[PDB]
Amino acid sequence: TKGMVYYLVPTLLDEFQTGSVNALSMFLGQVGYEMKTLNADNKTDAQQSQMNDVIALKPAAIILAAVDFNALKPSIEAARAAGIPVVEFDRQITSTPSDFTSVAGTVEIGHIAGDHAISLLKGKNGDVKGKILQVPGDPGDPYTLDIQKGFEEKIKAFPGVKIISVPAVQWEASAAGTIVSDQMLANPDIDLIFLHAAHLSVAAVASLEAAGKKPGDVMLMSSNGAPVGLDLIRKGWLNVEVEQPLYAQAAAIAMFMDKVVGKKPIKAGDYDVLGLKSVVTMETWGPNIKIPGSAITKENVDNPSFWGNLKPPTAAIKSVE
Numbered sequence: 001t002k003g004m005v006y007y008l009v010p011t012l013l014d015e016f017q018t019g020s021v022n023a024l025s026m027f028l029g030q031v032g033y034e035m036k037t038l039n040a041d042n043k044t045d046a047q048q049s050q051m052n053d054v055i056a057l058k059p060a061a062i063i064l065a066a067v068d069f070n071a072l073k074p075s076i077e078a079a080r081a082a083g084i085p086v087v088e089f090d091r092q093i094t095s096t097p098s099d100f101t102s103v104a105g106t107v108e109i110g111h112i113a114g115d116h117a118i119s120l121l122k123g124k125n126g127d128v129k130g131k132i133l134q135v136p137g138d139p140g141d142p143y144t145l146d147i148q149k150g151f152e153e154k155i156k157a158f159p160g161v162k163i164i165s166v167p168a169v170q171w172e173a174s175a176a177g178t179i180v181s182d183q184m185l186a187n188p189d190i191d192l193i194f195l196h197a198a199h200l201s202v203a204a205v206a207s208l209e210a211a212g213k214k215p216g217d218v219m220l221m222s223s224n225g226a227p228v229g230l231d232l233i234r235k236g237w238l239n240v241e242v243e244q245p246l247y248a249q250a251a252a253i254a255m256f257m258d259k260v261v262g263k264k265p266i267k268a269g270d271y272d273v274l275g276l277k278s279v280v281t282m283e284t285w286g287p288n289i290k291i292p293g294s295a296i297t298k299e300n301v302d303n304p305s306f307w308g309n310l311k312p313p314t315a316a317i318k319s320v321e
């Protein structure tokens, strides 16, 4: 064994989070690290306390996905000062250095979602008009902040589309259900609802159903690729799911961990991570790998490369030498 790695996961409340524990644990194990997971259960002060605890344990590395991206900056600094490598998973922290960061191309995921919304709202006469209800996730999470930026950039170019945006605080599907019910009663002309993770869409479907809607009446889209999302595609409720590449983000951390722990430089460039072109840059917050997401529709929903089909790579993750 090469040592222990602590993963500070923000919650265990959807398939991405629990999937990330499983993938990081398995992949790191393939490259000779034992992973231990601590769950913040959506409490910032818990995760901050967990950081102190783990710093005291002096592990080979810490993997953090911050509950709140502004709140954790001091903890990151403390860990690194104690000589412990810190890796950011999924939730990008740009305001202080980390030793590695592994994220989806989130602005690009918002762009893809934007392109599909536009396509979905384009009318017979070539114009783009309608009303979109957008349901971001928690404001403390750069994943949704950056998807929102990309999405809005696309949609704003077509001012005949009105957009209503209401975040689901703490990523709660229950909030999303309330939002969809209240907003649809006030705006019967909502044509499309874009939610930033598929577990939110599950609540949206129930809210639509309770208002008498059937699959396809209101177009629906979400943006993380979770299994419940792909199942809503198959059932006709969801028009599009723009996945983030969970397995690849996890695999990349395992692939580069020897370099992180060895304090060896991580060279900028294009890498293959589980078949995806993954881009490493040197940023002010340290080495960063950005891995692309993809749009999933009924036409390609069964592609085993998409993590919501729960067919992880068969072959050995290997350390980057």
Ligand SMILES: N[C@@H]1[C@@H](O)[C@H](O)[C@@H](CO)O[C@@H]1O
Pocket: 011, 013, 014, 016, 017, 090, 137, 141, 143, 144, 171, 197, 198, 224, 244
């Ligand atoms: N990128 C992840 C999503 O996949 C996930 O749904 C939320 C909530 O767990 O956290 C992060 O934002």
